[PDB]
């Protein structure tokens, strides 16, 4: 019934102010419960940052107290995180969450990735990975898309606009210099492709980029 | 700050077998009102944490009765009487007694499963990429177990370590397998000075490495 949603920039320059929004639907933030900000670092380490109560009082992690602020807009049913003087060490996934620790009520957002970096937003190059001969009369052929040289995370890869969801492996991005490299693979029977069109759809919001690549045979 | 110690770090269990996680708090989490505020969260791969247990032993709505939480003072335990496939993920405990709220390092639960050979595919660089002055050779190693795998690249018979980006997926919830991608990246020049490109996988399912390669002698 209740839904929490994080929004805000994905890329922030060092020393700037990070500003996030948590929009709440299905419950009023003036009624009850504590409304929290929690971030997860690479490595899976969780850190509670602070909360604002339904009454408007705030509690902050002492390690942040100096440069953290939490506010709310009671007319929009939103609460906000302001973190000053961010460093690259503040790179993390930020969640908002509502609970009270003695009741059944508990809801987390989906989280939003925040990268603190000086690097510029860079659109990906998407290359199609077609087999180099293999066998046409075989059970399964696997194809792929190579998403190379983008910044920052994340990117979304679907196949045929979400028509193929079985046979798909989208591998986590890896960093080399200051550019990410992601890859996806899909396995299909030898009968659909090449007789049918297989297209990978890459979306990079941070750069407002969308690209569709058909996997056409080279074979010969 | 109260620190929470989780054991074990990871945990490999067969479907239908029991499992338990320990959380030790440096201080007593017993508060001055007789309640003890310790919760358990489960973070499935790609999803956000979800609370399972609160106040030590109480189940959250939607949580199967397979889950049991016990303990007091400093020692707490989460017990999965019978592990299923969708129990796959990372478990945390958290204390809300002492300010500030603190979490454990987390315990990773993997599904112990029957061994499974990887299927290996190699892909030459796309024409598009080459007309840009770069060449990436990609090797997919799909649906294998266990996770320990070793990939080698050979260019014209010679092993190459530099320019190789490896990436693992998480445990697949449907078949409990793992997959990884191996990408070798060179300049166009470099790529055009050699003929054979090879992708060797070493895995306990195979006495000899399973090898895929191609020569630059085809569209």
């Amino acid at each position: 019934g209740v839904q929490l949603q994080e929004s805000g920039p994905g890329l922030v320059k060092p020393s700037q102010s990070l500003s996030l929004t948590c929009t709440v639907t299905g419950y009023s933030i003036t009624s009850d419960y504590a409304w929290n900000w929690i971030r997860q670092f690479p490595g899976n380490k969780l850190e509670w940052m602070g909360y604002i109560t339904y009454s408007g009082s705030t509690g902050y992690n002492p390690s942040l107290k100096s440069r953290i602020s939490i506010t709310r807009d009671t007319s929009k049913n939103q609460f906000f995180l302001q973190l000053n003087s961010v460093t690259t060490e503040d790179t993390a996934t930020y969640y908002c969450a509502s609970y009270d620790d003695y009741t059944w009520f508990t809801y987390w957002g989906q989280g939003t990735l925040v990268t603190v970096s000086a690097a510029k937003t860079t659109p990906p190059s998407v290359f199609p990975l077609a087999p180099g001969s293999a066998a046409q009369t075989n059970s399964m052929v696997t194809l792929g898309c190579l998403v190379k040289g983008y910044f920052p995370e994340p990117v979304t890869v679907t196949w045929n606009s979400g028509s193929l969801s079985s046979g798909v492996h989208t591998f986590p991005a890896v960093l080399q210099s200051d550019l990410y490299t992601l890859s996806s693979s899909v396995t299909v029977p030898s009968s659909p492709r090449p007789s049918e069109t297989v297209t990978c759809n890459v979306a990079h919001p941070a750069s407002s980029t969308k690209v569709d690549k058909k996997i056409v045979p080279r074979d010969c | 700050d109260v620190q929470m110690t989780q054991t074990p770090l990871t945990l490999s269990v067969t479907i239908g077998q029991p499992a338990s996680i320990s959380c030790e708090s440096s201080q007593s989490l017993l508060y001055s009102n007789g309640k003890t505020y310790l919760n358990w969260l489960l973070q499935r791969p790609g999803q956000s944490p979800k609370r399972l247990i609160y106040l030590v032993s109480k189940l959250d709505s939607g949580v199967p009765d397979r889950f049991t939480g016990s303990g007091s003072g400093t020692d707490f335990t989460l017990r999965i009487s019978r592990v299923e496939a969708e129990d796959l993920g990372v478990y945390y405990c958290v204390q809300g007694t002492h300010f500030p709220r603190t979490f454990g390092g987390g315990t990773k639960l993997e599904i112990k499963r029957a061994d499974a050979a990887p299927t290996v595919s190699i892909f030459p660089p796309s024409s598009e990429q080459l007309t840009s002055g770069g060449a990436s050779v990609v090797c997919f190693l799909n649906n294998f177990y266990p996770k320990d795998i070793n990939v080698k690249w050979k260019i014209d018979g010679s092993e190459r370590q530099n320019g190789v980006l490896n990436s693992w997926t998480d445990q697949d919830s449907k078949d409990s397998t793992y997959s990884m991608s191996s990408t070798l990246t060179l300049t166009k020049d470099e790529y055009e000075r050699h003929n054979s490109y090879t992708c060797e996988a070493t895995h306990k399912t195979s006495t000899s490495p399973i090898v895929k390669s191609f020569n630059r002698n085809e569209c």
């Binding site: 504590a34 109560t53 620790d101 003695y102 | 505020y37 300010f99």
Partner: peptide, 9 residues
């Protein structure tokens, strides 16, 4: 200091 106290007082 716990949330139960902070919310109910």
């Amino acid at each position: 200091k716990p949330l139960e106290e902070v919310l109910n007082l």
